[PDB]
């Protein structure tokens, strides 16, 4: 079932995930509504790829929850809120796990 198109998608998801965290920390510094729109656009782009990544589970469910928990931008003293920052970190590690898991199933 899984082809390298699913591998390219895991690539692109982690790329958008880091772009999400970049926009999040940029927004908390500058407090600009346009950056918020970009962040939700990137979050929406990640959501769409996760849907296309359905199948290919535990790791899938956790990625969807982190995506939902990151829906609102909470800032505190020019940085993300502590709970928001912990979610961003967890979301990035689940994405790393997703790349590993995806790459084993596309070739074994």
Author numbering: 49 to 104, 108 to 159
Wording from the paper:
Here, we report that the outer membrane lipoprotein QseG functions as an accessory protein that directly binds to and activates the histidine kinase QseE via its C-terminal domain. QseEF, a TCS responsive to multiple ligands including phosphate, sulfate, adrenaline, and AI-3, is essential for the virulence of pathogenic Enterobacteriaceae. Notably, genomic analyses reveal that a third gene qseG is co-transcribed with qseE and qseF, encoding an outer membrane lipoprotein anchored to the inner leaflet via N-terminal lipid modification. Collectively, our findings establish QseG as an endogenous activator of the QseEF signaling pathway via a conserved regulatory mechanism.
